């Protein structure tokens with residue numbers, strides 16, 4: 001039962017759990033539950049020290065850590081047993097040399113769609129992507145739209161989410177560009193045609209969840225995440241050079257964490273804007289954020305002073 | 310022919326060792342945020358380097374005392390001669406031509 005005011009050292013009655021919640025997105029959600037009060041049980045896989053930069057997030061005795069693997073059907077059953085809502089951001093980019101990547105969007109999101117359904121969670125949540133279509137594309141972009149089909153079977157109430165290409169602070173989406181000091185900028189594939197997608201700013205997505213986190217009355221009913229206006233140009237790849245003025249890694253280096261001459265180059269140009277009929281955002285709002293104004297901040301390079309844009 | 314073998318040997322250990330230190334973890338997968346937090350403990354510092362003179366003269370002031378102690382250098386080869394008086398009478402001139410050039414300026418060093 002919610003008490004007092006939402007500042008910090010308050011209650012607001014919701015527990016949570018957030019799986020993943022180390023890399024770019026998950027760190028940036030929990031930080032919005034280390035404010036309005038919660039009990040955020042964040043588990044994590046292998047990382048003892050990479051999770052510390054998080055801890056001054058909840059006040060005291062709010063967030064609490066566990067250890068888990070995720071192919072063991074117990075590790076997801078020991079935590080969640082006490083919970084209210086549980087969202088899931090889990091999953092990543094390139095196929096691992098260990099995890100074969102095929103069912104890590106299939107078996108894992110179900111492996112946590114195991115006893116969670118049984119044990120009496122509620123308002124369970126999962127992530128989708130605006131561009132994933134079960135027609136043939138794209139080797140990574142596929143297997144994600146399987147979860148929308150395969151996993152939706154379980155837990156009839158989901159409110160599974162469908163956002164666009166997002167640009168954060170430390171994000172890897174718009175940052176693959178401007179790291180491209182290289183033989184030259186070569187668009188994908190050397191064509192200025194279908195760029196760009198709906199680049200929503202990471203705050204609005206992470207303010208969507210906690211707006212649906214007790215919504216109320218969105219369960220089973222999936223939503224998709226509007227971008228700003230409107231579609232976009234080739235200039236986005238020029239815009240990068242317009243202003244820029246031209247976890248658990250290792251001790252020394254990582255052997256392979258590449259640019260992936262594979263799905264990566266073709267995942268960025270898949271565009272496929274899709275169905276409007278999803279509610280999907282202002283209803284869950286109120287948020288929408290532009291690009292032109294918010295792209296200076298995340299972009300700071302070797303002038304570090306001049307802008308005049 | 311073995312000198313250059315003893316020089317480009319030396320740099321090539323040094324010009325190697327920059328990359329195996331600077332560069333090797335430089336491409337490591339850690340965070341390395343671009344934030345303009347760098348340039349320690351004088352956070353912003355927007356100015357030109359102003360002309361400050363008594364910094365300057367201590368350049369010039371040396372450069373001239375420098376020359377003649379190249380002129381002064383071939384004494385110990387010249388100590389072997391025929392008529393030597395033209396040495397001692399002459400050798401001792403340069404020095405006193407050096408030491409004079411002090412005494413004048415010595416009225417004003419300023420804060421050096």
Ligand SMILES: NC(=O)c1ccc[n+]([C@@H]2O[C@H](COP(=O)([O-])OP(=O)(O)OC[C@H]3O[C@@H](n4cnc5c(N)ncnc54)[C@H](OP(=O)(O)O)[C@@H]3O)[C@@H](O)[C@H]2O)c1
Nearest residue numbers: 020022023024025026045089090091092093127163164166
């Ligand atoms: N909605 C979108 O716009 C969008 C865009 C790009 C990608 N995605 C996908 O939607 C989710 C957003 O992820 P993100 O933005 O937070 O980036 P992310 O770097 O993939 O974050 C995932 C975190 O969970 C970890 N992880 C990877 N595989 C795991 C597994 N089987 N089990 C447990 N943890 C695993 C990752 O490394 P650790 O195991 O060390 O924790 C990382 O810590 C991901 O699934 C991503 O593939 C979505």
